[PDB]
Design a protein around this ligand. Structure first.
Ligand SMILES: [Ca+2]
Ligand SMILES: [Ca+2]
Ligand SMILES: [Ca+2]
Ligand SMILES: [Ca+2]
Ligand SMILES: [Ca+2]
Lengths: 176, 186, 180, 181
């Protein structure tokens, strides 16, 4: 096929599939609303978010941190968000005791695969969590499809939902 | 009277917000189909550069560091499987990233790399970078202002910008491998 | 224009001679490094966290602190509560009151360990705060600090030497060899 | 029996500086072979070559040091030297065929590998053994022309600084026509 013919077809099809799957969140049955609410409550209570992601999702870890605390905060609060992947306490279990000792009120927010047992053990602990996983670990998580070709878009969409929900409660547009 | 806004219950609000969010995505989903050409040729030029042995020096504005990360990790994934190892460089992190004296950066870049092309995404946040992106060096510029005629023009305050970045990347990588794997001819 | 090989022999001889000459500098150091080290060790023993920062030229030394305090293989060592403050979202670019409040709410018991120049006012304000600190500075800010000379050609070695003193002191008390 | 901290630290400090003094002439005693290696590295830079710098896990700080010292935040009148963090490169070898070497050779006009410390995977080992020019600071003599560091030397960290300071002075002494090579 000629490049220019091919690309026209590819682009048309790409947009049509986005459109087709664009209502997926209306059908999503994992408890994302309740999890978002619980995470917002944690933030309001002065809690910290310790954010981690699988190897393929480091870009999305970066996205969370930069969006939650943008370079120019303007009127925004400085939110208690920590890059857990980059932490000396990331488990490769001394990690849990050190975490509990150093942070007043942490909650783990993890996205994607759980790539080692140390992390699994930490996430299975009693400390609160906001888990976006490819399979349920224990307790309601936000469930994603690992080989979904639209996964990357869905991650952005869920983040944008979370940030809107969070600031809607701040700024008193919405009550939990 | 008109009435001061009351306030909505979270669980009522979120259902409406979710519905509207997806529907706005659907409304806008055909945007690229409506774009009046030009971008295909720019993608083709970038692919030819890779085909010819060229390197991609990738930079992004402060808000798009995540997208710089995404480009690098998608083009050269952890498990290459059967893929080539593509010549892709994080230019943001480079010692040659200009402060200013873009002339010094440019000269060092030109002697260091056999065949560089600058792929920049977003705002150009200093004069040194602007000078280089204006240079004779081949470029793949995704900008908010049309600083060259041949650039991909992004809409800066578009609430859907982040998705469009993913979409353009996914178009690019598919176009690149379609040609690398002899599925299509340019 | 000396020949390279002649030049390098002289340079090497002189380099080692100057190291030797200045090698007893710490015996003559009059800033309160012993007291500051003790107070930092007590903080660590009390479950305190160390939030470590450094000026632009000393990012390598920030890295050195983090990797030495918590090496890849801990073996029998504790996991120490050490944080890269330069890299954190709370590092004050502007403004310091927001960062301080967020730090105080986030960490149970932080202590700031800063090395080198204080390159913005937000950091200065934080280091001026009530929060405990271990300050290795080119001029005294506040309370007793460990004083360094900015343009000392041997500065980089002295930084290593002070770290090595700190880590030996710390583990000496942890492994009950020494009592505070 | 336990020692008092303030007594202990005074002794420790004294002995620390004196050991540094005792060992301070180490480089003067070395067979001068390192001089030729430094010269070769300088000639590479003079000739328009790039330095692709890597380090073992324990020496990441020293990789940082090399990069920030060779190209400081304020260059003043200095040239912008062709120096690359190879650890951070997408071409850093893992598995993974020898895709890395071919991509490196096509990407860079004239690379030299400057590696410091342990060689922590076979892929890196393979490249550092390649025909590509190198400046290797190693714990075992994996080629005859390398700088040999003493691995469990308690003064290793100082010697790394000292060797770097030697290198940068040698490099600019030649760049600035203070010495002939
Ligand atoms: Ca619908
Ligand atoms: Ca145009
Ligand atoms: Ca072809
Ligand atoms: Ca030899
Ligand atoms: Ca000359």
């Amino acid at each position: 096929k000629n490049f220019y013919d091919w690309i026209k077809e590819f682009v048309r099809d790409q947009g049509e599939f986005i459109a087709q799957q664009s209502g997926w969140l209306e059908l999503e049955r994992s408890s994302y609303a309740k999890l978002i609410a619980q995470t917002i409550s944690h933030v309001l209570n002065g809690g910290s978010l310790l954010v981690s992601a699988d190897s393929s999702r480091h870009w999305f870890l970066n996205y969370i941190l930069s969006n939650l605390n943008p370079k120019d905060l303007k009127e925004r609060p400085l939110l208690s968000v920590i890059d857990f992947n980059a932490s000396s306490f990331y488990p490769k279990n001394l990690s849990l005791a050190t975490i509990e000792m150093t942070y007043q009120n942490p909650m783990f927010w993890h996205v994607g695969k759980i790539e080692n047992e140390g992390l699994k053990t930490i996430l299975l602990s009693k400390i609160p969590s906001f888990l976006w996983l490819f399979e349920e670990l224990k307790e309601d998580c936000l469930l994603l499809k690992e080989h979904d070709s639209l996964l990357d878009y869905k991650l952005l969409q869920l983040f944008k939902l979370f940030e809107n929900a969070l600031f809607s409660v701040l700024y008193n547009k919405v009550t939990l």
